[PDB]
Amino acid sequence: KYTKEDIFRFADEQNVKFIRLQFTDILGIIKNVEIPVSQLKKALDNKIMFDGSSIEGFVRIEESDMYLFPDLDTWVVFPWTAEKGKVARMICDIYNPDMTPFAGDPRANLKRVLKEMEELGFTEFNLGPEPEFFLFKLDENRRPTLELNDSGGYFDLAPTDLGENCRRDIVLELEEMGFEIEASHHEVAPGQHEIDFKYEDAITACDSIQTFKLVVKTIARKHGLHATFMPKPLFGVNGSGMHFNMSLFNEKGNAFFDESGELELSQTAYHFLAGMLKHARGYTAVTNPTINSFKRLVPGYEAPCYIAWSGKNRSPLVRVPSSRGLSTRLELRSVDPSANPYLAMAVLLKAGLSGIKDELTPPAPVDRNIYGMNEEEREATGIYDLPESLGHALIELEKNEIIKDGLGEHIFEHFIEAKTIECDMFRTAVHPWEREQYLEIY
Amino acid sequence: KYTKEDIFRFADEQNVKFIRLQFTDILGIIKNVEIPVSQLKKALDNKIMFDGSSIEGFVRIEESDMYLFPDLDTWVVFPWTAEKGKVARMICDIYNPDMTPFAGDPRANLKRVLKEMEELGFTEFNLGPEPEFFLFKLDENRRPTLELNDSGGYFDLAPTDLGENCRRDIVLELEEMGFEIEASHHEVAPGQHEIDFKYEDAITACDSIQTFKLVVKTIARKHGLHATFMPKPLFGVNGSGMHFNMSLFNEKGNAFFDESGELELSQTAYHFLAGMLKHARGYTAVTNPTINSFKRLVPGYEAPCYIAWSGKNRSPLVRVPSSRGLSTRLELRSVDPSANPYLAMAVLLKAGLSGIKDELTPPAPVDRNIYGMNEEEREATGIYDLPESLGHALIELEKNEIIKDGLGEHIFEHFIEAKTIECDMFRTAVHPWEREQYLEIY
Amino acid sequence: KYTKEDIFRFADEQNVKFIRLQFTDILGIIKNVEIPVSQLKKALDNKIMFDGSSIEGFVRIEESDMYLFPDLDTWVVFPWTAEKGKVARMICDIYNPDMTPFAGDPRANLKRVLKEMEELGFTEFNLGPEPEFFLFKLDENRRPTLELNDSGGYFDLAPTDLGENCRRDIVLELEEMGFEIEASHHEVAPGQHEIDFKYEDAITACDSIQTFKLVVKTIARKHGLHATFMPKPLFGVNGSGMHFNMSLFNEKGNAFFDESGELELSQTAYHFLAGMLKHARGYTAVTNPTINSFKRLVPGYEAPCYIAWSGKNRSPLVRVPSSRGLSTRLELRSVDPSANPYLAMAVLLKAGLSGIKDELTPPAPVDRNIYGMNEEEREATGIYDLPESLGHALIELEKNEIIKDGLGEHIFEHFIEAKTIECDMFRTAVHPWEREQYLEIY
Amino acid sequence: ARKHGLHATFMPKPLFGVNGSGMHFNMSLFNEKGNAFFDESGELELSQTAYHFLAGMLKHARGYTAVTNPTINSFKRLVPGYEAPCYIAWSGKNRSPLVRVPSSRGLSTRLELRSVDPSANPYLAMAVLLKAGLSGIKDELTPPAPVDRNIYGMNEEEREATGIYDLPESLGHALIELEKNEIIKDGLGEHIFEHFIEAKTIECDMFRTAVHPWEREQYLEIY
Ligand SMILES: Nc1ncnc2c1ncn2[C@@H]1O[C@H](COP(=O)(O)OP(=O)(O)O)[C@@H](O)[C@H]1O
Ligand SMILES: Nc1ncnc2c1ncn2[C@@H]1O[C@H](COP(=O)(O)OP(=O)(O)O)[C@@H](O)[C@H]1O
Ligand SMILES: Nc1ncnc2c1ncn2[C@@H]1O[C@H](COP(=O)(O)OP(=O)(O)O)[C@@H](O)[C@H]1O
Ligand SMILES: C[S@](=O)(CC[C@H](N)C(=O)O)=NP(=O)(O)O
Ligand SMILES: C[S@](=O)(CC[C@H](N)C(=O)O)=NP(=O)(O)O
Numbered sequence A, B, C: 001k002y003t004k005e006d007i008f009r010f011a012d013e014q015n016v017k018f019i020r021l022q023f024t025d026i027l028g029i030i031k032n033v034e035i036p037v038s039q040l041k042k043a044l045d046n047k048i049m050f051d052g053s054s055i056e057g058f059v060r061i062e063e064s065d066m067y068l069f070p071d072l073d074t075w076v077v078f079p080w081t082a083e084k085g086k087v088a089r090m091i092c093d094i095y096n097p098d099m100t101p102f103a104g105d106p107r108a109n110l111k112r113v114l115k116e117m118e119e120l121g122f123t124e125f126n127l128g129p130e131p132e133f134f135l136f137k138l139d140e141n142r143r144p145t146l147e148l149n150d151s152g153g154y155f156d157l158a159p160t161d162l163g164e165n166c167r168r169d170i171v172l173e174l175e176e177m178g179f180e181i182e183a184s185h186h187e188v189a190p191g192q193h194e195i196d197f198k199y200e201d202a203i204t205a206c207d208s209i210q211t212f213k214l215v216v217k218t219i220a221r222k223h224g225l226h227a228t229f230m231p232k233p234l235f236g237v238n239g240s241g242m243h244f245n246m247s248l249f250n251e252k253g254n255a256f257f258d259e260s261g262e263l264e265l266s267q268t269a270y271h272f273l274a275g276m277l278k279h280a281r282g283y284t285a286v287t288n289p290t291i292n293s294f295k296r297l298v299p300g301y302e303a304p305c306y307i308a309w310s311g312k313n314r315s316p317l318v319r320v321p322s323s324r325g326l327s328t329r330l331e332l333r334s335v336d337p338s339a340n341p342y343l344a345m346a347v348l349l350k351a352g353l354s355g356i357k358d359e360l361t362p363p364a365p366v367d368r369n370i371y372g373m374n375e376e377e378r379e380a381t382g383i384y385d386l387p388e389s390l391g392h393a394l395i396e397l398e399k400n401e402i403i404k405d406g407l408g409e410h411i412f413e414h415f416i417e418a419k420t421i422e423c424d425m426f427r428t429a430v431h432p433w434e435r436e437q438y439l440e441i442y
Numbered sequence D: 001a002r003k004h005g006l007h008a009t010f011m012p013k014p015l016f017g018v019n020g021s022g023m024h025f026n027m028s029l030f031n032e033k034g035n036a037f038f039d040e041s042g043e044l045e046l047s048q049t050a051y052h053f054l055a056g057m058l059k060h061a062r063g064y065t066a067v068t069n070p071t072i073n074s075f076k077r078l079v080p081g082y083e084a085p086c087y088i089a090w091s092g093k094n095r096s097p098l099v100r101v102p103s104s105r106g107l108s109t110r111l112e113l114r115s116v117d118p119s120a121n122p123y124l125a126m127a128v129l130l131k132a133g134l135s136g137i138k139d140e141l142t143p144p145a146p147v148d149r150n151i152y153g154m155n156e157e158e159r160e161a162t163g164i165y166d167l168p169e170s171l172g173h174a175l176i177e178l179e180k181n182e183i184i185k186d187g188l189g190e191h192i193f194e195h196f197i198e199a200k201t202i203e204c205d206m207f208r209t210a211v212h213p214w215e216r217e218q219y220l221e222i223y
């Protein structure tokens, strides 16, 4: 671990000129603030505060002021404009102005739910994310246009992948930022891109996740493209969802690796599935917290629509990678990069770990393509259907009170509040699919 | 009633050059077929075949041939086809090859549930609608637009209102045709106008409805304008509702009249309220069948949001006009001019007179503004809420037995299938609302 | 008098075909509704109901429904709809669902405040108005631009006055709608037009005022010209003010002409001035009920700016024209055509009758040029300065609990309501004038 | 800004319905290497010289605004909802009040007024606030209560029971309050209060006489 004494030798050796003090509000939207190195020694004394009332979902105006205490192991110098003034950043968690951890800080909400796997004896909650994104041209006045960069397919090549050295430029800025990057490839739908990096422990992947979107949204705009993580920006082509690959660890042993059980899988792992597969209706308001992603959760675009699992199959809610061993993991296909990568782990760990204290006997793997089975056979197995909209997905969580509890209270309260606001916002609005279909006809 | 012999020689007296047999699909789309006075008999003798296969709501293509039997009492000439192409009109009911009348004919279903008030003593089922519409300008193309013939308000004057000379040439287009036009004027929302008339027998009022829709559609663009009966084409302005006044008649007496009361409303009337009010949540998917409809069903826009009633008050679902005389009526305002007239009367009768066959008791008339009630202050007075989406109001129809059987076995089967796939395109497409809200921020 | 029998009779004579039942809301905004001759008898029976809640200032929704009682003396055929659908108008009064009038009806309020002379003995209260209006060009698509039709001056000739045969035709439709037209001409500011008509009694001159604007607005937009009665649409030019020429009568004796006192004015005449002269600080929220009219009230454009009077002089708040006899009158110039004439009347009556039963020593004529006396010399006489804005006008009214009594309480409680939400609307807005002077300058 | 393509404005309210720009005024005095507001071991750590400074400004608030919000436009910012001080009051770590007390004290204790946009004349704003704020210590004035709730959510005549009145509504309204203030006037100068009260009245006059487009939009078509 890093101390306050080796941060002085990264401001002075690396010759940075600023430190960006970042964090994430409830909605998964990173917000940061920039200080001259002249103040470095004040932030590290934790004496730095902001307006809480304007961070969406934190605190009300009568007690606005709130504290910022930096995290030290998260230091990463910035490899873009570094001659102008080299930049640094330290991310962290927010305290209320009494030196108490804020309950609206999602990070702290993850570190609270992380202490519930030490009593159960687990040393790391590893996660590998695959945040799939799109790339759109920028118009003459730098305003993102409806045209995508390329018309490419899956795993395609020049001349049919215009973000070739564009993605390349992303991977390099990540490489400089201590990353260990797995693969770089175009994806199924036109303009769809994926860039794979190795898993880290729970809160360092969330860290390396919200870190990831900034490297792509700025660096794509140096190639003239606007990157987006909206789940289904285009109707009719593969939405871009952020697959969550998770594994539990126990003293250098992956607790999910046991080559005896039917699929070379362990018992703490089969148990973990049903931990999610019964409360999956619950958290698909957390893990899919946007009106748009309920357009991705519709069948046929290698996105999950029903609650089941299988080995190697890219139809169901859980897919078991044909590779195993230490790289053993459980892939959850419903999370999309419009989720909050902190609220996700707390909401999925508790949901998951709920199936180690009871373990609730997971079902049989639907080992077909689950897209094309009738309502007469979705019934036959008993596979729950996934929430139609956010309207339904919300009431399906205030009923799962193990998920409501992996959310604290503050974070739950401001959420069903906010997402019923957006959900009600959109239900009353007349957008022009209803004018075409009905105006000219009735 | 009209004769088969005084219509054949009703041509040589006005020189009628063509005849239009017309009927109604499952949606409210007045169909047609034009034929000369040449063929006058062959239609009168009900040997006018056609294809139900392509008409939405009728038989499949392996048994497609169907016949037209006119209802010779419905006879007018249009006052625009003058001496060149003088057009006659009837309205047909549908029958099979076996000449068994058709099992999905919407005008049969109403003609059929019209004698279920017969077996308990009622002369006529009175209906008088107040259908609002919106008026849009045109272009060089002679096609619709987004701007409305005037920016006006309730009752305003020319120049602030600009259909002033439109609706005049509209009404006295129906006035020739045989209507008792009560009022023409400009309703609340700009470009939205109301023309209403005196009540009529159930089939012959809704016979007179499809006349008013067509006639308004036609005389509108003769004056350069577009005539939409869309329920909610714009945001923030009053919807367009096809108001429902109705009343039951018995031996020269309005069965709702209570000659010398302080309520002037019989307990047979009072029972009809609970008749619908109870089944309200079940047949409103027929009172507002389009996905846009439910965006008009919201507070503030003089439109019912809650199942409740009050007197001389235009917030509650059922308004009680304080003019009674014989003109006594209960006015359900939860309809917009998209529902099928020959079937929202069936599915409003089959339920409302089940409030008398079962003799239920209507709740407290809540003579406050119902919108003003707190989220749960109206949870105490029991006034619950209308269905949210067409998806939610569709489930509620499939379950209600009362209105399901006042709808037909072939009409409910081929109406639930469409509105789900009509509801499904809506759920699966993405609308520009969402790139506006999600693209550049996630 | 005009009985219901002559008017049934009147119809079949001229071949009128529609009936227009009009009325004035709280603000001056003439509303109406159109019905055929077929319902003329449902009108005269006083059995036509309308919407109370969507007319501004009337009533709430919880008791929406209200009735319409025709006044049959106002009957005039609208001459501009020759032969096709002829029309004819009548000016109604409002009664509740209990056949009792509306305490908020602006016509019944004038009626009420008129009975206060019936007990102090006055036959008639004459009023002769001078509604000056502006004319603007139109666009190609029938939408009023900001150019004026002519750059003329006071009284100028063609062709320095494009609307010469606009006013000419304006006068003619009035000459067949029962008007005795006094004079036609051009006004001070370019594109301005004054057409005077001889006085009528209190509630007939108001009716003939509102009939004037319906006929100047309509006829002018038949000249490709938009007519406005804004008090000052342009800055820097003479506003348009609708002068009030009122006179009181006693037994064919104008109670103001008694050829003795200092200007052949009577005791009742001089006395009358006193009431308004002090009280004027309370009624220029009614007589000038619009922000744009306090831009009119600046000095130097023949508009009153301080409360004083003089003879033949156009500077002070009350001019007496040097003509007398039955031509004896008083002229208040504080009123602009942007006010409610009935409410203006109900307000200036109790504010002039109070100058009869106390009579309060009307001040001596300020026979100078009132714009050319400094603030030292305003304070010299003690001449009150007119209220600065609409906000300053409102609060200076609610202290006059005798002018609030000329309104009633339904009327007053709604008028201060709206003008407070409206005067609030402009106080908060950020309009172009402010960006100009402050953005590139600060 | 112009070296990097853009135009910079300090206009207090160049749009509608969004937060305005404002020159917060965090003030503190010093006494012989000492922060005159610090009471190292108080309950509020707020010296009874801080409180008397609080009263000083909060009493004269209504009348020295025309020196701190001199533009007609400044009063288009003094409205609720946009973190702008609308009523004369004070509380801690709360952004609704006129005077906000930020929680961190150390040696850096402050009471923060938020009713100044970067349009006022700082050389003269301080002269106004020292004069009339040390008028509450020299007069040992006692402050009104903290209202430690968000002030905008208080009823129309509610804040009258708790005694908190409101700030001037318009420049005219604010100017009268100054002309009737002698504490800040003599803390302002005789050549300055003379050339300043003649200067903003015409500037407020122009605003009053001219017709804005809002009046042609609203009233041309209907009226
Ligand atoms: N044992 C593991 N635990 C957690 N995450 C893992 C593990 N193995 C791989 N991952 C994650 O899987 C991601 C790679 O996904 P990808 O190659 O697209 O697999 P697939 O195509 O099968 O979905 C990497 O980002 C990595 O972090
Ligand atoms: N006895 C009755 N039965 C059915 N409908 C009636 C009866 N009496 C009046 N009506 C209807 O009331 C309606 C009145 O229209 P309108 O005056 O616009 O109503 P509203 O006051 O709700 O706007 C007419 O359409 C008429 O058909
Ligand atoms: N005795 C009277 N009572 C009421 N009004 C009168 C009387 N004599 C004249 N008037 C009014 O004076 C108006 C003439 O207006 P105008 O010629 O513009 O005079 P001025 O230029 O002084 O305003 C007429 O409209 C008429 O109604
Ligand atoms: C086959 S795909 O699986 C396409 C992903 C899809 N668009 C989705 O996320 O739903 N992605 P990957 O194999 O990299 O996990
Ligand atoms: C003034 S309104 O009252 C407006 C209600 C709205 N048009 C609706 O029914 O959606 N209806 P009506 O005048 O026909 O009674």
Ligand SMILES: C[S@](=O)(CC[C@H](N)C(=O)O)=NP(=O)(O)O
Residues within 6 Å of the ligand: C130, C132, C187, C188, C194, C238, C239, C240, C241, C242, C243, C296, C301, C302, C303, C314
């Ligand atoms: C000379 S004027 O007097 C114009 C009045 C002024 N322009 C105004 O109303 O602002 N009107 P009139 O001669 O009819 O009395």
Ligand SMILES: C[S@](=O)(CC[C@H](N)C(=O)O)=NP(=O)(O)O
Residues within 6 Å of the ligand: A051, A054, D019, D020, D021, D022, D023, D024, D082, D083, D084, D085, D095, D114
């Ligand atoms: C977040 S804000 O707190 C908003 C201030 C407000 N816009 C104003 O007008 O002063 N002010 P700051 O961060 O400068 O203390």
